[model samples]
Target: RHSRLILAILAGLGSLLTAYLTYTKLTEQPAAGGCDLVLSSRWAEFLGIPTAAVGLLGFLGVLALAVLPDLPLVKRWRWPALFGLVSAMTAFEMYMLYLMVAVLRQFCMYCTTAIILVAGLGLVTVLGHRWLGGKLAFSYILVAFLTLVTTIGVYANQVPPPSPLAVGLAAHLRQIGGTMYGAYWCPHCQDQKELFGAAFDQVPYVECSPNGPGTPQAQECTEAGITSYPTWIINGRTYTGVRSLEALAVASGYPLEEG
Candidate 1:
């Protein structure tokens, strides 16, 4: 009993942390600031809806099950709730792991902690099956249905807004005969992209590897002589280094300082 209590406390703390991080990041300032420590703005949304909203819902459902452990028909309810929560968490963990290993190329400590906690919860629930009976199975099913509905509702709101520097970079590339090529795991590529802000959509980009999305002519990076991260072919001259936003501005035909 004491062991269960300790586990419950840990689970609650972990869930609260996950929920708080998700909420804060989802509602974070669009221009970029504090959230950078826990998650990139890129993780803020997929398609359109904020990822934090998903986390918020998931954590709430888990908390509901945790708090109602002794409800009538406890066996039916607990197992299903445990499984559903674990499933959601596992899926989310895989997605974040992919981003860290493939796209972001860097780990967010908070996000990693959340994944660990979710995995631990899954192990605990599976090993403690005797503690779970079939009382509230239908309730879990209902929660699952509601979760799906909410996810769909959030996903339906996606819209593409305009980007600034990416557009400018595209325009500049057109004039200067340059090309930018990057890989998903390249930190420098992300840095270059950060400069574009919302206009990142405008910058013509080539992905060096085909492991992730937004790869343009992925097979041609090597052919184009891109040998380093954030590689740029400027005026037919290859520049293989991290370029500052100001440097890019000047090289790409914009003023060194922006108004």
Candidate 2:
């Protein structure tokens, strides 16, 4: 009796959590600046809907089940339905947990809290509604696990694509003999590479200090007159420091389309 009330309350709160998270995604302005990395990541969207929207809907389903008046038909299927819904929610949350921990290595606060709520709802449904037989219980559990497996398979098959800007810039730089001389331990070099992301491999680069930090400079670098952490030599012009892609494109005479 009271378990339904507790369940409704948790579900309501969970719904609020997911709603706020979805709002943050839609607005593209998180509660804390750049704090919603996991939510803003490529993994957070599916079929034009934010993941938080799914959680929001799931929690609403649980809330409706918890709050609806217990009638003859309702009481008959109530516990099993609630149990199955929570099982599905818990399964998705587990996938999110695996992504957050192993793949992303980043934490979404709202998502973490949603996991707690879903896990708690699952435990409460099991303990409070104990009449659900092993056969029906296992049936729901089996489908939940299947959903988890399917989600993992789908996400794992996705290929990472570099943006057109990165591709174009890398190609142009390579075509016009643009060379960036940098050391292995140099922070600025790492910064420039991060700007290029996956397309950095195509950009012509020569290791200046190949023996690690504070070591003897490479012969190729000395011969090229490289004297900085990250110095780009493009068409006989020197660009010292970590330069933006736009700046690099301008120097290399690459026509970059802008908004």
Candidate 3:
């Protein structure tokens, strides 16, 4: 009873976290402070779906599992179902941790908090069910590792190029005296460039890193008080972090193309 209660609480919290992330992505608004840098990366999406949408569904499924065990119809299969769900979640969290540390090299407080929640859930599951032993855990971990590797491989190869609308927006941004200050090594900066597709060449971009690509605009960046990659200077105001094309158009006073 107590275990179910705890799981329910954790699932509820996870749901809220993912919902906020999804909201931010859909609205193209900045995520919670430092998390904006992490959230704006290409890895935040799978195919075209926001990763937070997946997280939201997973958490909801866990929540349902916590309650379904009480139902007579599902009670017979409860243990197996709970074990399977929790173990898969544990594996998913492990892959996310790998991405956070090894691939992104950036930390999102919300994501870290969610991982801790999942870790707690894993510990609780193990204590509550001795039948799901170390071997099962190992198997789940291996499966999760392979799943993440394959998914990332496919995404890296199959991702389509940006649209002409994006390129036109980039060109319009430059025409409006908008400038993107970025570093060559910054993933977020690269993400911003990718949004412009082949027309990134037409944007008013300044290389901020001292050793980065093109002629480094170190002095100009310093003069502009730029401290972050993908910083945008629009209408004499410095805006940090990635901005969506819609947001960029509004900020730079550019009209969007009619549908």
RMSD of each: 7.9, 7.5, 7.1
Error of 3 at 228 (Å): 7.1
TM-score of every prediction relative to native: 0.53, 0.65, 0.64
The parts of candidate 2 lying over 4 Å away from their true place are: 71-73, 153-259
Per-residue lDDT over 1-259 for candidate 1, one digit per residue giving the tens place of the 0 to 100 score:
2234434665676767766765665565332212352255355575455565566566666666666757588657675666777666655667667767664555666677778877777666656565444644554456546655554455345434444545666677756756778765565566676666556655667877765433443658867766666788776566777686557766666754446
Supply every candidate's count of residue pairs whose N, Cα or C atoms clash at under 3 angstroms: 11, 0, 0
Better of 2 and 3 by lDDT: 2
lDDT, model 2, position 86: 88
Which window of ten consecutive residues has the lowest lDDT sum in model 1? 29-38
Give the Cα lDDT of each candidate. 0.61, 0.80, 0.75
Order of models, best lDDT first: 2, 3, 1
lDDT of 3 by residue, 190-216 (tens): 677766766778889887865534444
What is the per-residue lDDT of model 2 for residues 120-151, given as tens digits with 9 covering 90 to 100?
Answer: 89877877765737775676679688878777
Model 2 TM-score? 0.65
Worst 10 residues of 2 by lDDT: 31-40
